[PDB]
């Protein structure tokens, strides 16, 4: 109750994140672009960089 900080309700969320052998799944807001083969490219795929 608000009658109680010490004994008052606090919401908790734990977000836990996975890097399995699978393709990635839960993705950021970033924008994709063209696949420039046979040149020295800096790259991100899916955070793998």
């Amino acid at each position: 109750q608000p009658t109680n900080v010490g004994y008052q309700p606090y919401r908790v969320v734990v977000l836990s994140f996975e890097l399995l052998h699978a393709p990635a799944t839960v993705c950021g807001p970033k924008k994709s672009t063209n696949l420039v083969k046979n040149k020295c490219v800096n790259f991100n795929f899916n955070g793998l960089t």
């Binding site: 399995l20 052998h21 393709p23």
Partner: peptide, 24 residues
């Protein structure tokens, strides 16, 4: 009713193209 299993029951542990390799 019984047998020797022989070399059976393996399964892919992960989705990686490792190739031409002995890997533990």
């Amino acid at each position: 009713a019984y047998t020797n299993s022989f070399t059976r029951g393996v399964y892919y542990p992960d989705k990686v193209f490792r190739s031409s390799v002995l890997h533990s």
